[PDB]
Amino acid sequence: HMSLKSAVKTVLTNSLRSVADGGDWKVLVVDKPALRMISECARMSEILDLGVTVVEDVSKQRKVLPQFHGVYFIEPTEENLDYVIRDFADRTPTYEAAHLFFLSPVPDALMAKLASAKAVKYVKTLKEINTLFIPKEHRVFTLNEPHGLVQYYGSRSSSYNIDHLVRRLSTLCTTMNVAPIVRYSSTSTPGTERMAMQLQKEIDMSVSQGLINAREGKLKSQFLILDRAVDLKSPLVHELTYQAAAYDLLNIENDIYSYSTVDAGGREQQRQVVLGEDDDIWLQMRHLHISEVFRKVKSSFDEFCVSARRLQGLRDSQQGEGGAGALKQMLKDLPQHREQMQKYSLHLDMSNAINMAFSSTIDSCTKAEQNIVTEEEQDGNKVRDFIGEVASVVVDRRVSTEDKLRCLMLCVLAKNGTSSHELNNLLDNANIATPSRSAIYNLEMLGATVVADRRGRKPKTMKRIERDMPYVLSRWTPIVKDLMEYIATGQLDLESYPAVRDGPSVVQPKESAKPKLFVFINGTVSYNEIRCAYEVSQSSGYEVYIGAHNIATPAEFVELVSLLDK
Amino acid sequence: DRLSRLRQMAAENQPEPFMADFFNRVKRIRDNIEDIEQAIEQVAQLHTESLVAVSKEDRDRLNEKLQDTMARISALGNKIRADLKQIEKENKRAQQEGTFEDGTVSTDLRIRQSQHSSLSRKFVKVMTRYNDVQAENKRRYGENVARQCRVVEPSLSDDAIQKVIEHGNEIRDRHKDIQQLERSLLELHEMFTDMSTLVASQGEMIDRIEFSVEQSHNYV
């Protein structure tokens, strides 16, 4: 389908247009998991002219509307069926009828409960959609589990339930319509290996079941399954590409950014907008270096104004207060363009905010982070005293606790073994409160070895591709990118990353086409790893899709790791 | 499939209107918008067709359709604008009544608000297509028709731009044709103006599904 948002919207559309009603408006009754998935693939405006007039939460259900057919997107769960048998049960039904679409297969015990209750007479159509994964971005899928990392590697990991996880992920293959070879690391945790085994049988039990039909070209679709431990550095590094820097340095809760502009009059009007796929500047700009974004948004804004006046008949001889006076004159002269204007004012703002937040302090942290993480300087002079690299940052009292933590964590990852004593002293010199130190020690639970007496873990044996990295604060490349490119070239050892089946089917010489590569990392995915799936799609060979239980910024990843033992 | 299996496993055991006038207006608005959409793409041809085309033989034949469809697009426009405004006032004069504290609203008012928002946008976007084809044609309805009609004066670059701009056989009618496109652009501008400020204190977030279903009610 190319985009996961397109793919998910298509299932919603194909399902809505299968509802056999009398042609009145529809009521879309929706789950929490359904709400999240649908909300991320369709605006309200796109739902309206798909013939639904309201969206409702399966819980509560006030306002009875018998003139309209109810359509349910909902999970095969007792709590839900009780809401359904309840919306009808009583004297007057709640909709003209119910059209039930289940997010995954419905058990028989529940099927019976529905058959015995009154509701049975009202249920017209009942299907199993096979889609329960959040389409966050065109190339990013998510499980809406913000504590995934904890539930999976934490001190309750034993009882995770990798079943519901395998089915959620196989969902990715049915709605995408592709039957991939499953790949995993030789050094996968047992929990993970099993998950990869089971995923293979799931998609296969779907293919011999005609839930997915493919042609199987020369190159093959693969589904790479990874432990967070594949790369513990990427989640931590300050990053200077637009999306990644915004989410790190700025306050972006649930994808909402707040800024201040002016309208006709009233100044400091505080707008909240969502960052997303329906904003053309966001796209195209989001994977660019921030220094370059700063100035293209400005260019694009000025070009837009100059052009939008030549489409009518005018000319910009009036420049007051710079580009603010352009924004005032545009909203006055060309009201038509009010929305493009809001779009530019948002990125003018966000661009600037990033530039300001990237203080000399943050630059210091970044330089140190790059040196530690690539293990050489801009120069190329190998760096060996990782603890010395950090000292500069850690004395600096202008530096956030969280920032110090990030540098410290990167430091013990590099050292790969540090004496209890030298480590307890580093933490003391850094003035890191003892409760906050679980961010360091809990790396053990992701297979890191931090203290030297716990015994070092055998070195990761994988060549790094080696790239031309121009920008001096952007020399680090996430490991996951190398995994991607190797696979897009069958060049990824079967001993290092074995297939469940058809192993020799990825041999190596010593638009709507192209094979898919799904990458799923347990726990957390990073914006720099997300960027990689895009870079690697537009470069060579495959179309790449990346995902995890949730997206975590560097701050959120620090919090998660600190929670692994609590 | 799974529907058959249910009706098999269940046989082994044995209204008021609701906002009628409102759904009328939005049907009307949707319908008018679609009408305008088709009308716009016909004014497109009628304009580029009045280029050359055997002088006044067909010019009068075309300008007859143009200002006919133009007037319809306008009449359809004003209705849409009045139906929208009517719903705005209707909604505004229903806030305090349709909120029962709790922060929640009321399926009636929720529906009205998402309809009102969605269509106002759909409207500004359609009219923008209109505004674009008008100015698009008015720019060349002076370049490759009014100016290039200097087959009377040898005037070069400035004496044809410094003169034609101010006044503006068949070069006499194109003036009446340019000032048409001008009171068109003006109506549109006027419209876009109070349509823009009309989204103020509205939306910013309403197109988000999650937002709507958060302000739902309950308790029967």
PDB file of C-alpha atoms in Angstrom, chain A residues 5 25 30 32 35-36 38-40 42-49 52-57 59-63 65-68 86 106 111-112 114-116 120-130 211 256 263-264 270-278 310-313 331-339 342, chain B residues 1-7 9-11 13-19 22-23 26-27 30 98 100 104-111 114-119 121-122 124-125 128 131-132 135-136 138-139 185 189 191-197 199-200 202 204-214 216-220:
ATOM      1  CA  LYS A   5      -1.896   5.347   7.037  1.00  0.00           C
ATOM      2  CA  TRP A  25     -25.852   8.941   8.141  1.00  0.00           C
ATOM      3  CA  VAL A  30     -15.441   2.882  18.531  1.00  0.00           C
ATOM      4  CA  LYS A  32     -10.017   2.866  22.780  1.00  0.00           C
ATOM      5  CA  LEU A  35     -10.143   5.215  18.439  1.00  0.00           C
ATOM      6  CA  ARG A  36      -6.358   5.491  18.414  1.00  0.00           C
ATOM      7  CA  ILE A  38      -8.675   5.443  13.286  1.00  0.00           C
ATOM      8  CA  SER A  39      -7.711   8.844  14.694  1.00  0.00           C
ATOM      9  CA  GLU A  40      -4.235   8.486  13.241  1.00  0.00           C
ATOM     10  CA  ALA A  42      -8.343   9.960   9.202  1.00  0.00           C
ATOM     11  CA  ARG A  43      -9.404  13.505  10.135  1.00  0.00           C
ATOM     12  CA  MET A  44     -13.019  14.259  11.190  1.00  0.00           C
ATOM     13  CA  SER A  45     -13.649  15.961   7.850  1.00  0.00           C
ATOM     14  CA  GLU A  46     -12.655  12.716   6.068  1.00  0.00           C
ATOM     15  CA  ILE A  47     -15.007  10.740   8.302  1.00  0.00           C
ATOM     16  CA  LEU A  48     -17.914  13.106   7.690  1.00  0.00           C
ATOM     17  CA  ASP A  49     -17.902  12.692   3.960  1.00  0.00           C
ATOM     18  CA  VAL A  52     -20.539   8.960   9.437  1.00  0.00           C
ATOM     19  CA  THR A  53     -21.901  11.954  11.355  1.00  0.00           C
ATOM     20  CA  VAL A  54     -20.573  11.188  14.857  1.00  0.00           C
ATOM     21  CA  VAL A  55     -17.905   9.097  16.476  1.00  0.00           C
ATOM     22  CA  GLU A  56     -18.801   7.666  19.896  1.00  0.00           C
ATOM     23  CA  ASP A  57     -17.044   5.732  22.661  1.00  0.00           C
ATOM     24  CA  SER A  59     -18.598   3.003  26.749  1.00  0.00           C
ATOM     25  CA  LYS A  60     -21.323   5.441  27.952  1.00  0.00           C
ATOM     26  CA  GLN A  61     -23.493   5.467  24.836  1.00  0.00           C
ATOM     27  CA  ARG A  62     -25.942   8.210  25.616  1.00  0.00           C
ATOM     28  CA  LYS A  63     -28.207   9.680  22.897  1.00  0.00           C
ATOM     29  CA  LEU A  65     -30.355   7.353  17.414  1.00  0.00           C
ATOM     30  CA  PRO A  66     -32.642   4.770  15.766  1.00  0.00           C
ATOM     31  CA  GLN A  67     -32.679   6.680  12.442  1.00  0.00           C
ATOM     32  CA  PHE A  68     -29.000   5.819  11.898  1.00  0.00           C
ATOM     33  CA  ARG A  86     -26.812  -3.375  26.227  1.00  0.00           C
ATOM     34  CA  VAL A 106     -13.726 -13.324  18.112  1.00  0.00           C
ATOM     35  CA  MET A 111     -20.038 -15.368  19.964  1.00  0.00           C
ATOM     36  CA  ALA A 112     -22.538 -17.436  21.964  1.00  0.00           C
ATOM     37  CA  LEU A 114     -24.225 -12.423  21.644  1.00  0.00           C
ATOM     38  CA  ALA A 115     -26.413 -15.081  20.014  1.00  0.00           C
ATOM     39  CA  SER A 116     -28.509 -15.567  23.169  1.00  0.00           C
ATOM     40  CA  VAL A 120     -28.794 -10.906  17.687  1.00  0.00           C
ATOM     41  CA  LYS A 121     -31.810  -9.751  15.639  1.00  0.00           C
ATOM     42  CA  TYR A 122     -30.203  -6.345  14.990  1.00  0.00           C
ATOM     43  CA  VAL A 123     -26.721  -7.434  13.920  1.00  0.00           C
ATOM     44  CA  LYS A 124     -26.417  -7.100  10.138  1.00  0.00           C
ATOM     45  CA  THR A 125     -22.899  -7.951   8.913  1.00  0.00           C
ATOM     46  CA  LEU A 126     -20.108  -9.138  11.261  1.00  0.00           C
ATOM     47  CA  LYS A 127     -16.492  -9.336  10.071  1.00  0.00           C
ATOM     48  CA  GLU A 128     -12.920  -9.654  11.373  1.00  0.00           C
ATOM     49  CA  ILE A 129     -10.817  -6.762  10.049  1.00  0.00           C
ATOM     50  CA  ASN A 130      -7.362  -7.992  11.201  1.00  0.00           C
ATOM     51  CA  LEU A 211      -5.681 -13.604   4.085  1.00  0.00           C
ATOM     52  CA  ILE A 256       0.719  18.850  20.086  1.00  0.00           C
ATOM     53  CA  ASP A 263      -4.844  37.233  13.793  1.00  0.00           C
ATOM     54  CA  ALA A 264      -6.693  40.224  12.329  1.00  0.00           C
ATOM     55  CA  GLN A 270      -1.864  30.784  21.514  1.00  0.00           C
ATOM     56  CA  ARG A 271      -2.371  28.119  18.843  1.00  0.00           C
ATOM     57  CA  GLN A 272      -2.143  24.417  19.545  1.00  0.00           C
ATOM     58  CA  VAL A 273      -1.687  22.343  16.429  1.00  0.00           C
ATOM     59  CA  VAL A 274      -0.920  18.637  15.915  1.00  0.00           C
ATOM     60  CA  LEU A 275       2.255  17.675  14.037  1.00  0.00           C
ATOM     61  CA  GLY A 276       1.258  15.234  11.303  1.00  0.00           C
ATOM     62  CA  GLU A 277       1.050  13.934   7.745  1.00  0.00           C
ATOM     63  CA  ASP A 278      -1.433  16.536   6.470  1.00  0.00           C
ATOM     64  CA  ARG A 310       1.386  37.571  -8.541  1.00  0.00           C
ATOM     65  CA  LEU A 311      -1.500  35.117  -8.841  1.00  0.00           C
ATOM     66  CA  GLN A 312      -3.676  38.146  -8.223  1.00  0.00           C
ATOM     67  CA  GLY A 313      -2.327  41.600  -9.102  1.00  0.00           C
ATOM     68  CA  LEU A 331      -4.105  37.643   6.231  1.00  0.00           C
ATOM     69  CA  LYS A 332      -5.629  41.003   5.344  1.00  0.00           C
ATOM     70  CA  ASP A 333      -5.108  40.960   1.567  1.00  0.00           C
ATOM     71  CA  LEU A 334      -5.415  37.222   0.837  1.00  0.00           C
ATOM     72  CA  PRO A 335      -7.697  35.790   3.576  1.00  0.00           C
ATOM     73  CA  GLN A 336      -8.070  32.722   1.323  1.00  0.00           C
ATOM     74  CA  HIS A 337      -4.595  31.657   2.381  1.00  0.00           C
ATOM     75  CA  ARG A 338      -5.187  31.816   6.166  1.00  0.00           C
ATOM     76  CA  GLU A 339      -4.324  28.111   6.589  1.00  0.00           C
ATOM     77  CA  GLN A 342      -0.860  29.226  10.041  1.00  0.00           C
TER      78      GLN A 342
ATOM     79  CA  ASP B   1     -18.741 -15.496   6.620  1.00  0.00           C
ATOM     80  CA  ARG B   2     -18.679 -14.982  10.385  1.00  0.00           C
ATOM     81  CA  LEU B   3     -22.209 -13.545  10.102  1.00  0.00           C
ATOM     82  CA  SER B   4     -23.691 -16.802   8.813  1.00  0.00           C
ATOM     83  CA  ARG B   5     -22.035 -18.691  11.674  1.00  0.00           C
ATOM     84  CA  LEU B   6     -23.721 -16.320  14.161  1.00  0.00           C
ATOM     85  CA  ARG B   7     -27.263 -16.567  12.770  1.00  0.00           C
ATOM     86  CA  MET B   9     -25.714 -20.335  16.336  1.00  0.00           C
ATOM     87  CA  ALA B  10     -28.640 -18.105  17.354  1.00  0.00           C
ATOM     88  CA  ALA B  11     -31.432 -20.091  15.694  1.00  0.00           C
ATOM     89  CA  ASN B  13     -32.185 -21.544  20.766  1.00  0.00           C
ATOM     90  CA  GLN B  14     -35.702 -20.985  19.426  1.00  0.00           C
ATOM     91  CA  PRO B  15     -39.154   6.974  15.456  1.00  0.00           C
ATOM     92  CA  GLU B  16     -38.632  10.756  15.675  1.00  0.00           C
ATOM     93  CA  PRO B  17     -36.929  12.947  13.013  1.00  0.00           C
ATOM     94  CA  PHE B  18     -33.975  14.442  14.924  1.00  0.00           C
ATOM     95  CA  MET B  19     -32.653  17.763  13.626  1.00  0.00           C
ATOM     96  CA  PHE B  22     -30.336  20.896  10.069  1.00  0.00           C
ATOM     97  CA  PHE B  23     -29.404  17.781   8.060  1.00  0.00           C
ATOM     98  CA  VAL B  26     -25.858  20.430   5.197  1.00  0.00           C
ATOM     99  CA  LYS B  27     -27.241  18.263   2.388  1.00  0.00           C
ATOM    100  CA  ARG B  30     -22.788  19.670   0.230  1.00  0.00           C
ATOM    101  CA  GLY B  98     -25.775  21.978  25.335  1.00  0.00           C
ATOM    102  CA  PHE B 100     -23.971  20.009  31.277  1.00  0.00           C
ATOM    103  CA  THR B 104     -18.912  17.328  28.140  1.00  0.00           C
ATOM    104  CA  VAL B 105     -21.273  18.458  25.378  1.00  0.00           C
ATOM    105  CA  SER B 106     -24.187  16.782  23.615  1.00  0.00           C
ATOM    106  CA  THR B 107     -24.335  14.580  20.546  1.00  0.00           C
ATOM    107  CA  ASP B 108     -26.622  17.209  18.951  1.00  0.00           C
ATOM    108  CA  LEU B 109     -24.152  20.069  19.413  1.00  0.00           C
ATOM    109  CA  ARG B 110     -21.108  17.865  18.732  1.00  0.00           C
ATOM    110  CA  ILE B 111     -22.542  16.837  15.338  1.00  0.00           C
ATOM    111  CA  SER B 114     -18.161  19.006  13.209  1.00  0.00           C
ATOM    112  CA  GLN B 115     -20.558  19.585  10.294  1.00  0.00           C
ATOM    113  CA  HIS B 116     -20.179  23.354  10.571  1.00  0.00           C
ATOM    114  CA  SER B 117     -16.373  23.181  10.667  1.00  0.00           C
ATOM    115  CA  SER B 118     -15.865  20.591   7.957  1.00  0.00           C
ATOM    116  CA  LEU B 119     -18.104  22.347   5.410  1.00  0.00           C
ATOM    117  CA  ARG B 121     -13.366  24.477   5.107  1.00  0.00           C
ATOM    118  CA  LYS B 122     -14.700  22.534   2.107  1.00  0.00           C
ATOM    119  CA  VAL B 124     -13.268  28.133   1.318  1.00  0.00           C
ATOM    120  CA  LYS B 125     -11.225  25.524  -0.571  1.00  0.00           C
ATOM    121  CA  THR B 128     -10.331  29.321  -3.717  1.00  0.00           C
ATOM    122  CA  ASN B 131     -10.788  32.782  -7.087  1.00  0.00           C
ATOM    123  CA  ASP B 132      -7.780  31.190  -8.787  1.00  0.00           C
ATOM    124  CA  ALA B 135      -7.530  35.998 -11.405  1.00  0.00           C
ATOM    125  CA  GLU B 136      -5.706  33.435 -13.580  1.00  0.00           C
ATOM    126  CA  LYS B 138      -7.957  38.161 -15.730  1.00  0.00           C
ATOM    127  CA  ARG B 139      -4.157  38.288 -15.897  1.00  0.00           C
ATOM    128  CA  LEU B 185     -12.451  38.880  -7.076  1.00  0.00           C
ATOM    129  CA  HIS B 189     -12.253  38.666  -1.134  1.00  0.00           C
ATOM    130  CA  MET B 191     -16.262  36.468   1.451  1.00  0.00           C
ATOM    131  CA  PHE B 192     -12.864  34.998   2.302  1.00  0.00           C
ATOM    132  CA  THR B 193     -12.457  37.837   4.780  1.00  0.00           C
ATOM    133  CA  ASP B 194     -15.370  37.080   7.112  1.00  0.00           C
ATOM    134  CA  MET B 195     -14.890  33.360   6.390  1.00  0.00           C
ATOM    135  CA  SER B 196     -11.370  33.491   7.807  1.00  0.00           C
ATOM    136  CA  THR B 197     -12.188  35.431  10.952  1.00  0.00           C
ATOM    137  CA  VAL B 199     -12.857  30.150  12.051  1.00  0.00           C
ATOM    138  CA  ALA B 200     -11.365  32.238  14.856  1.00  0.00           C
ATOM    139  CA  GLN B 202     -13.541  27.878  16.361  1.00  0.00           C
ATOM    140  CA  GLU B 204      -7.861  24.629  15.592  1.00  0.00           C
ATOM    141  CA  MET B 205      -8.384  21.112  16.978  1.00  0.00           C
ATOM    142  CA  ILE B 206     -11.930  20.103  15.916  1.00  0.00           C
ATOM    143  CA  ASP B 207     -10.764  18.200  12.817  1.00  0.00           C
ATOM    144  CA  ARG B 208      -9.143  15.756  15.264  1.00  0.00           C
ATOM    145  CA  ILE B 209     -11.300  12.704  15.992  1.00  0.00           C
ATOM    146  CA  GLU B 210      -9.894  12.065  19.454  1.00  0.00           C
ATOM    147  CA  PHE B 211     -10.933  15.607  20.374  1.00  0.00           C
ATOM    148  CA  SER B 212     -14.596  15.172  19.441  1.00  0.00           C
ATOM    149  CA  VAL B 213     -15.140  11.832  21.235  1.00  0.00           C
ATOM    150  CA  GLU B 214     -13.483  13.232  24.391  1.00  0.00           C
ATOM    151  CA  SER B 216     -19.050  13.068  24.821  1.00  0.00           C
ATOM    152  CA  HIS B 217     -21.859  12.823  27.372  1.00  0.00           C
ATOM    153  CA  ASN B 218     -23.508  10.061  29.385  1.00  0.00           C
ATOM    154  CA  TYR B 219     -25.881   9.072  32.211  1.00  0.00           C
ATOM    155  CA  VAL B 220     -28.940   8.760  29.964  1.00  0.00           C
TER     156      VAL B 220
END
